[PDB]
Design an enzyme around this catalytic site. Sequence first.
Site, PDB file in Angstrom:
ATOM      1  N   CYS A  32     -77.807  27.063  -9.415  1.00  0.00           N
ATOM      2  CA  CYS A  32     -76.503  27.504  -9.114  1.00  0.00           C
ATOM      3  C   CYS A  32     -75.467  26.654  -8.897  1.00  0.00           C
ATOM      4  O   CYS A  32     -75.826  25.454  -8.461  1.00  0.00           O
ATOM      5  CB  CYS A  32     -76.764  28.244  -7.663  1.00  0.00           C
ATOM      6  SG  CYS A  32     -75.600  29.008  -6.994  1.00  0.00           S
ATOM      7  N   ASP A  34     -73.353  26.448  -6.459  1.00  0.00           N
ATOM      8  CA  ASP A  34     -73.210  25.984  -5.172  1.00  0.00           C
ATOM      9  C   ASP A  34     -74.587  25.307  -4.527  1.00  0.00           C
ATOM     10  O   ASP A  34     -74.723  25.130  -3.343  1.00  0.00           O
ATOM     11  CB  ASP A  34     -72.887  27.166  -4.105  1.00  0.00           C
ATOM     12  CG  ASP A  34     -73.759  28.248  -3.916  1.00  0.00           C
ATOM     13  OD1 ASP A  34     -74.828  28.188  -3.734  1.00  0.00           O
ATOM     14  OD2 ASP A  34     -73.122  29.422  -4.237  1.00  0.00           O
ATOM     15  N   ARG A  36     -76.910  22.351  -3.500  1.00  0.00           N
ATOM     16  CA  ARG A  36     -76.542  21.060  -2.765  1.00  0.00           C
ATOM     17  C   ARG A  36     -77.314  20.067  -3.628  1.00  0.00           C
ATOM     18  O   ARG A  36     -76.458  19.090  -4.159  1.00  0.00           O
ATOM     19  CB  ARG A  36     -76.827  21.182  -1.563  1.00  0.00           C
ATOM     20  CG  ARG A  36     -75.816  20.748  -0.733  1.00  0.00           C
ATOM     21  CD  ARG A  36     -74.719  22.103  -0.498  1.00  0.00           C
ATOM     22  NE  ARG A  36     -75.202  22.715   1.000  1.00  0.00           N
ATOM     23  CZ  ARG A  36     -75.038  21.998   1.836  1.00  0.00           C
ATOM     24  NH1 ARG A  36     -74.491  20.982   2.340  1.00  0.00           N
ATOM     25  NH2 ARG A  36     -75.446  22.953   3.255  1.00  0.00           N
ATOM     26  N   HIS A  88     -82.252  29.549  -4.309  1.00  0.00           N
ATOM     27  CA  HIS A  88     -82.444  28.561  -3.245  1.00  0.00           C
ATOM     28  C   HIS A  88     -81.950  29.499  -1.991  1.00  0.00           C
ATOM     29  O   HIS A  88     -81.225  30.313  -1.976  1.00  0.00           O
ATOM     30  CB  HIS A  88     -81.507  27.532  -3.384  1.00  0.00           C
ATOM     31  CG  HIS A  88     -79.961  27.817  -3.667  1.00  0.00           C
ATOM     32  ND1 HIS A  88     -78.993  27.343  -2.760  1.00  0.00           N
ATOM     33  CD2 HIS A  88     -79.336  28.370  -4.397  1.00  0.00           C
ATOM     34  CE1 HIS A  88     -78.011  27.519  -2.903  1.00  0.00           C
ATOM     35  NE2 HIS A  88     -78.071  28.244  -4.191  1.00  0.00           N
ATOM     36  N   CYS A  91     -77.991  30.981   0.188  1.00  0.00           N
ATOM     37  CA  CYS A  91     -77.048  30.989  -1.178  1.00  0.00           C
ATOM     38  C   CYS A  91     -75.804  31.632  -1.015  1.00  0.00           C
ATOM     39  O   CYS A  91     -75.860  32.893  -0.662  1.00  0.00           O
ATOM     40  CB  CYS A  91     -77.838  31.516  -2.396  1.00  0.00           C
ATOM     41  SG  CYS A  91     -76.977  31.527  -3.731  1.00  0.00           S
TER      42      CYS A  91
END
Lengths: 208, 208, 201, 201
Positions: A32, A34, A36, A88, A91
């Site tokens: 993804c 976003d 981290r 994750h 999200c």
Amino acid sequence: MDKIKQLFANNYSWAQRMKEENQTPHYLWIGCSDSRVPAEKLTNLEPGELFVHRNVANQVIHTDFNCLSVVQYAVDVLKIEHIIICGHTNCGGIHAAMADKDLGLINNWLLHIRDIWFKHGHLLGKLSPEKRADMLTKINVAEQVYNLGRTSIVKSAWERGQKLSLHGWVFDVNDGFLVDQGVMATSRETLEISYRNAIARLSILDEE
Amino acid sequence: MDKIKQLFANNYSWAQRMKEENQTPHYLWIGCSDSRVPAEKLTNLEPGELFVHRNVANQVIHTDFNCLSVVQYAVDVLKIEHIIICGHTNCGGIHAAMADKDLGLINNWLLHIRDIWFKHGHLLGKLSPEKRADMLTKINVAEQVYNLGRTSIVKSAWERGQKLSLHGWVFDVNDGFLVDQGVMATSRETLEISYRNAIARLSILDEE
Amino acid sequence: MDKIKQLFANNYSWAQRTPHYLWIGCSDSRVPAEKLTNLEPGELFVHRNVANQVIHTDFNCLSVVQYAVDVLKIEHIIICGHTNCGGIHAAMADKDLGLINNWLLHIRDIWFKHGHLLGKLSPEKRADMLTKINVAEQVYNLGRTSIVKSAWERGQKLSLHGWVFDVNDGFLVDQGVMATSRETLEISYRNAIARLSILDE
Amino acid sequence: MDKIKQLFANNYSWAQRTPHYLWIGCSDSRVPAEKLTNLEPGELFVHRNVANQVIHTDFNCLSVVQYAVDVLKIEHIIICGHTNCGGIHAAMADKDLGLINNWLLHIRDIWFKHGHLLGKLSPEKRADMLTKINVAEQVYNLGRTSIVKSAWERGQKLSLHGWVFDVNDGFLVDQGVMATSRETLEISYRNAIARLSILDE
Ligand SMILES: [Zn+2]
Ligand SMILES: [Zn+2]
Ligand SMILES: [Zn+2]
Ligand SMILES: [Zn+2]
């Protein structure tokens, strides 16, 4: 502006420091935008062993030229044997898919997540509202694996005897562990029993 | 298979070790799927400050829904002020674009690089064959910045007074430095003088 | 060659001898929209693709909808399916056809969605039932795009229609999902499926 | 409403009263391919989009080319431009139109490519010159796709054509780029541009 000057400075000193102190890719990682933690940190591997695509909410949409180009290049040209979809917790994509807001061009991309919600509504419905987003992050990973296993590129690889496995995990930031959602496919038949078992298991709820 | 078991093991011990020992994003980073070093390492920043898209040969193609969705979400929803296109030396995408081989679905994606080659043929032509790929990696970054600055999303942001800068760098693995190719745009007029100067500078060749 | 050389002759002897609707139809269909509706040239702005789809993330179909809605200012969008559709029959079969199968997986999802209904039906009538259900579902998709919902939001006049053209008798048949706003989209979509679920002997 | 209510009536009273070519045309154009060529229904398999483009990475147009070439087994692909094209005029202007401008940047690149030629031309004839140059360039693009080059590679019979339909006199005019292989693509593309560069008083 200062932020750009700071990258140049951070870069110059990192390179100097690495020098002061002192490759075939094997996995295609679909994660993804976003997320981290980068995949190379989380999995603790050396530079070059992951070929990486990142998009919003780690999707394999049936007709995306960008993601499908990457999957074809990895499978047919580079000969990679494992594709991994990693979701994750917390999200931003999934939360944006459940909210009722109009965000522009990006909402079109997120409509694929809303269709998955309705597919499992009777289960999610008899669940208390505040626990639904965590169940949906899990079910999304299971459905994206199901999607990757139905592409012409993956089915044709299996048909011609090429070794290839598909995996669906969730990265739990709260303990740093990767958790298996139970859909694992090495063929078309294993994709179906495995997908069906996983949903039935995910459907027995906590009486509380 | 063993490689998957090894990720699970590498993950479990990394998480254990991090625990034994012991966020708004500010840049949109558009880099290459075959780049080796992750952007967070190279730029030495903390998790979460980069929102990241990676595709083959770090392209901004006029009509890609995946990359354009990410750029719209970053600019309009997250309010990021700097977009960076980073190329890199020894790029597998660029070499694949110059070769004459048919690789399947991926060649379609690479045809945008071949059009850039012909645009600067008279210059590249009076260059010795063995030096052309390095000049083209540089010129590609300059042309992708020129492309990003012409999108409806970026031009509309500039028109409504939103602060936004575009940058085009090359990561040189041979010394770890990021090198500025000279196209830097904060507006439509600066995009043109800057693009035009850069090409004229890139065109004075070493007499050797 | 010959086939082409002929084409020019036809045209050469043929030459001797603001649109108000956006039409989304199938690349198969053989009767042009202009013919079966009997409209003047330039009245229709036309997009055609395989099995008359509005896929959430297609830049080609979306560009046309935005250009039509925002720059030309069109007030009606029609999605037209048809009987004996090649895309539909291709989606129900098990063959692998290459790149196109990826485009067709969107139809197979719709099939699973209505499996009990279709499963207590006779085998020989299931494809016709799926062609009808597909149209209902694509209108539902068009009504959920950001471009269409933003036009409604800001007060622009725009209506959505979903019909089936039957080659047998030549008549368009309204499938019952019709939307002028988001709430009318929900109610008519739900009522339409419930009717389809009452089965006759 | 009214406009729609009428549509059904027309059709209802109208109902009372293997394809061999893939045609890629413009969503603007008003005379259907079927009309100006005079062909039987089902002969043409049709895709239409804004300014008759073959963009290297469009899944919609590429899917149709693969389905046509690999599953239906069609032997001719025709790209047709036209005079007074809205897409073309929109590309030459400086206005911002939204999502569609992104689709149109592909045309503006083609303009810069031929700037000296166009720059020693009279202002009032430059758009017609660009419409002609666009067709030449899209055939050049179609001939460079992996789907088309792989068919040639494996020996399949397939030819590419690039014409301009003039609304004034109704005649298709061949622009001179015609390809049955990769080498014939190069030579005819180069000769075509050189002719365009000889200018008359
Ligand atoms: Zn996420
Ligand atoms: Zn690269
Ligand atoms: Zn059809
Ligand atoms: Zn046109």
